[PDB]
Design a binder for this molecule. Sequence first.
Ligand code: SF4
Ligand code: SF4
Ligand code: FE
Ligand code: FE
Ligand code: FE
Ligand code: FE
Ligand code: FE
Ligand code: FE
Ligand code: FE
Ligand code: FE
Lengths: 633, 633
Amino acid sequence: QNLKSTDRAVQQMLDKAKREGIQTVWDRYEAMKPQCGFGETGLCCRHCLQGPCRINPFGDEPKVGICGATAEVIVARGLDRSIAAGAAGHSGHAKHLAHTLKKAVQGKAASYMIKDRTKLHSIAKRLGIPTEGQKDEDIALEVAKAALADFHEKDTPVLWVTTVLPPSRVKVLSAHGLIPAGIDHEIAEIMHRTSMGCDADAQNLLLGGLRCSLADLAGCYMGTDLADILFGTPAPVVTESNLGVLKADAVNVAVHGHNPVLSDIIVSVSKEMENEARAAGATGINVVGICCTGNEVLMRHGIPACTHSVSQEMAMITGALDAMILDYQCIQPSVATIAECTGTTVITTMEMSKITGATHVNFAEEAAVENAKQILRLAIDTFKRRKGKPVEIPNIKTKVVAGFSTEAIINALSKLNANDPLKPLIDNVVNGNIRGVCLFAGCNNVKVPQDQNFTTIARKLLKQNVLVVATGCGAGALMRHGFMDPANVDELCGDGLKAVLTAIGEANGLGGPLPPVLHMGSCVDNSRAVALVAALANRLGVDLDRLPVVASAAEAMHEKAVAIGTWAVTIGLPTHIGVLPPITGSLPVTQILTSSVKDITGGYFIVELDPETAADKLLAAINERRAGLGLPW
Amino acid sequence: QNLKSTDRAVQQMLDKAKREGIQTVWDRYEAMKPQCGFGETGLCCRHCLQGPCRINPFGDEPKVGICGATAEVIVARGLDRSIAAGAAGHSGHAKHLAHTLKKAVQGKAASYMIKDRTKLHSIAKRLGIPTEGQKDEDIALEVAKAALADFHEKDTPVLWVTTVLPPSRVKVLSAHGLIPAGIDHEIAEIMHRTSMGCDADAQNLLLGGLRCSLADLAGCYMGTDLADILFGTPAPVVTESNLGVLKADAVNVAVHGHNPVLSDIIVSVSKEMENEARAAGATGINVVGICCTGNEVLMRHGIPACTHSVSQEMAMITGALDAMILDYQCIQPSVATIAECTGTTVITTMEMSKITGATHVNFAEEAAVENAKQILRLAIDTFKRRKGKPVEIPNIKTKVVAGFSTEAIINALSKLNANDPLKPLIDNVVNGNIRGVCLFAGCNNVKVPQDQNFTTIARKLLKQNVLVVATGCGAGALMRHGFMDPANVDELCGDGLKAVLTAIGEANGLGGPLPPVLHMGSCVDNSRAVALVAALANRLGVDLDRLPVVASAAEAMHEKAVAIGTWAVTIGLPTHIGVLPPITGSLPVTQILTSSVKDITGGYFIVELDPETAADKLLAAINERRAGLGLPW
Ligand code: SF4
Ligand code: SF4
Ligand SMILES: [Fe+3]
Ligand SMILES: [Fe+3]
Ligand SMILES: [Fe+3]
Ligand SMILES: [Fe+3]
Ligand SMILES: [Fe+3]
Ligand SMILES: [Fe+3]
Ligand SMILES: [Fe+3]
Ligand SMILES: [Fe+3]
């Protein structure tokens, strides 16, 4: 079971599902091989009823789509559509948060409120929204209206793009017409231009896709900002991760998905429902996290991460998972089917995200508490049915220090320098103690043994004094293998990095160093690493395509991840992706994305499937940026 | 060449392309067989990097996607995405027209203006925009701002849905949450919910898709209204169609695509460029039409339709086609490749729709004339290169009477009854002289011998006294076979229909009958047939799902067509489609779309690939609606 997952709890539960006869994602993957060469290479198109059209990667006819579409065009249209669908997911989540905020500050959802006034003021001022003499509800109402405004055309471009990148980057992007005019506008225009009989030039297509990926960036940044206003800016926390955070003698309730609007209230209501949890023989309600909603409650409240991504079903396999509460995105629909064998109540809540088989509780921000209890009651109900029956929880769990928002990191650096908090980080970059910065992002993928690319690449980079920050299921993969535990700095980190992590730690009231990897939150919280990197650029007066920053979607899978990789390339970063995107059917497009895009944005894609090789190329790019600053490496 | 096209000019040019060695769409289709069963049935999914996932239609594993997605879900997600991409095309076109209007009435594009004040006033009042005491530029500015507003969320739903259907239909749709909140909002939400890990229930998905198809309806209706304000409401015209409208001794310039913003100005500038056309040995500039832009200039100015859809390349094969001026949608990118053999200047103009190989002229509404000349000069330039060299134009052309907007039709009926213009049409329905109304819509498809389903089904329906109206390439297929020629009423139409077409004709100052098919315009002008059908419903006080109206996408192909079929079902119509949509891999979804949807909207899909069988089922549905009114049949 090692070619499936490098996670030991996951291997134990895989053995269980094998003997109990429950189909897993790896099983469905095994029944899918050998996969379609056309699909994998991108040479498949079904945008009209004359198709499907396939193009042979190598050989005789068909050399071209029925309508005449070349391989360059088929590949670039497919990729543009994945960028747009990612942008739709991130943007829908942030749009929901903006409606939540407007409802709140107009007295419509008393379960919600402004929990971070500093953040709201810094945002409203980033946007040129007047603060002084204006009351908070009016300020937040303005901020929310602006968020909603960024989804359509208007007098200004998308503010959550133009006001969050260094103006030099904004100028570089505006010269090539890359600035989104509206988030949903860009999504619709992608769907227009990639449909049959429209755009038929690969450069033109890919430029459209770069623009749409900045629309996605805006969705991420909006979601981060709005969720921080609404639920508090993450600050460092200590919790634990892996399946061992589940307890047999408690009501175990998993928050799973991406949108914290629901699950943060779940977290807060669960505490008061203890009185009722006891009357069923439970120590209480044990709220754990799966995927990105889980990372959100782990960043804000120290909620332990139970599992992530490709191994989410393994949670239910323990037999101790009483309630799985979904919102949307990255939920394997198999959980519904699986719940009949493991005894779990699987509950959907968002009306555009139901799974056939599941129970649906219609959540709305206005009646939050009334539904939260309704769900948790059901959770305790299921704990009745499984009282005194054999659970198998692998006793595997790790110590996780997380909650490193960009604000937390700037506060952490301030204790070394109160009026120039970025100065110490810059100094240790300049003298080699930090070789560069690498952001691990994205999901697990069934094609890659779970966490293998993440942990391998992280191992080389840490041993090379690269500051590593991580989000979403990247942060999940690293924390489940010890990389968010300060006690592992010694083994993992090279001497200089060790020194800096130690200096900051001892200077922040601990006598111990920061974790070896900085957990920065969920998928939209990739925006946080932009905020930091932008700040870095600004404090040094250069564009991002000169900083020794890189990014790695080491085991990418979802369309969100493609949009994210593309907007890391678009804001200047060298961007590795550890699974094939479907571009290898076109050398011109591959060449545009790994090279000639260098000439437009300074970023570029690094396609490398071997994790050791990928760490080498990532260090090579970091070191090239060093050499461009005149820096030693 | 008869299994390719039932059009005789097209067969002549197919023989030419065969001997000259030019690859055609039928050739690329031949090199694509046998096509992918997975694709054709809808059991293929590539929404994430773990795919591609295929599901065997019948047999052993794979029975399910890697993530767990059942076949019901894969099919409904694919179909939702095609609905959304259609909606994106229609909505982008209308959004462009709304920007054109705002620019015009703010003194920004003097090449454009209000050419129909009656239409603008009737629209502004349909929307509750105040007219009296307000000047026209302010009224149109308000109308345009409202159009732009319907693309995003706001205080009201999409006005170009709620104010154009009978309120009973609006209530029926609002009860099931089917009313769009924003056009691009619905598109984005479709892309969100159909991506991996989100909506996983087929009914929930298909309801989302119904809503998105009404967003597409709104795009069509907006485009029709704005283009009518801007360029005039079509009134009956006489012109000709088929390749024989090309002339060897003139500069032949084809307007091709969907968006008339450019090509209407092309039409108007071409007349004055005669002085320059003569100085090259040309009788002038011979502007013809291809596809829907062509239908727009055929409805408004009597521009002859040269060809349509699957046979567009055949135009260039004559050797007489000097300039092909594209905007976007339904342009086979092969034309670029083909232009090097036929000597045609292929010119793209829209910046999100370029074909590698073509010349791009950057059009903008503000400098319209300056670019139009630039393009036409090039056209005349090419007429120099081909002076005194062998063209083969098939001398095949037909007489076309068209320009039957809903206003033109209501005016035509008024001469029988001035104060109750719909009364005579209703009376002849009620007494059997009109059995029902059938709208032919959509494109040609390479899988069907060109025009065969259209002409066969039209033949049965006309012989059964069914009023037939037609749009886009449906209207193209019928007019190229004589169905828009009054001289064919005798042969085609049954006695009662003949009588009504004759009465209206003789009463409209001709002594001859209306054509056998009412040409109502382009793809967005499907909206016109809604306006009529709605008016009919209103004049009778019933919902559309009780009128003997049906619709037929007899040879559908593009994603636009799927969105259109779905919103004909959603507004109540029985809707035949003469090519397989990719739904047959799921009986539950097929059943939802051909039956259980009856219980939600009153419409339903009729999947029938045999055109005679389809005419039978279309008559059966018309006659069932008759029986529901208590009517004889
Ligand atoms: S758009 Fe072109 S390549 Fe794609 S399915 Fe249709 S005919 Fe084939
Ligand atoms: S979303 Fe599911 S079915 Fe579609 S490609 Fe990904 S794993 Fe396969
Ligand atoms: Fe995840
Ligand atoms: Fe995630
Ligand atoms: Fe993910
Ligand atoms: Fe993610
Ligand atoms: Fe067409
Ligand atoms: Fe058309
Ligand atoms: Fe078409
Ligand atoms: Fe069309």
